[PDB]
Structures are given as C-alpha cells and as structure tokens.
Amino acid sequence: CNGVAGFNCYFPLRSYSFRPTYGVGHQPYRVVVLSFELLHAPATVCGP
C-alpha cells in the first residue's frame, strides 16, 4: 500500500464520537483494573 490509503489498505484506528444524545447503552464508561500478587515477599503494601 506504499503508506497510502486505498482498498485493502485501512488505517487501524477508529473514533467514538460521543454525544449526550445516544442511548443508555452507548455512553462512555470509565474502567480501572487492580491486579494483585498474593505470594511470599517482604509484603510492601497492606491495610489498616
């Protein structure tokens, strides 16, 4: 595709274009994932 757009040459990114008007199942959601590792170690972090 020599770095130019065309058939079978698609740019692998897409946009959302959120507007306050879409339905309840289409608005953006904010997601955070917490990962632990419960093993044997100096145990740097834990609670009160």
Add this chain to the structure above:
Amino acid sequence: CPFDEVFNATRFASVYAWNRKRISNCVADYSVLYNLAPFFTFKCYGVS
C-alpha cells in the same frame, strides 16, 4: 451463488423503486467484488 447479475445489470431501478433481492442456501465469495472498477467506496458497519 449469483452476484454477477445483480452487479453486471444493464438496467437498474429507481430510488423510489429500489430493487430487492434475497440470497440463501449458497456460498458467498466476497473477493470477486474487487474489479468493479478503479476507485469505489466500500464501507461496512457492524463487522470488520
């Protein structure tokens, strides 16, 4: 299954009489949908 006669058609239909076709019980080859010409628009929504 035939996509030739729906694309290589001499006479087409008006916008208010848009031509209908149903296709079932066949094997669809969507690769030979490439040489319709140099430059055409190919956009699909829902699937890659």
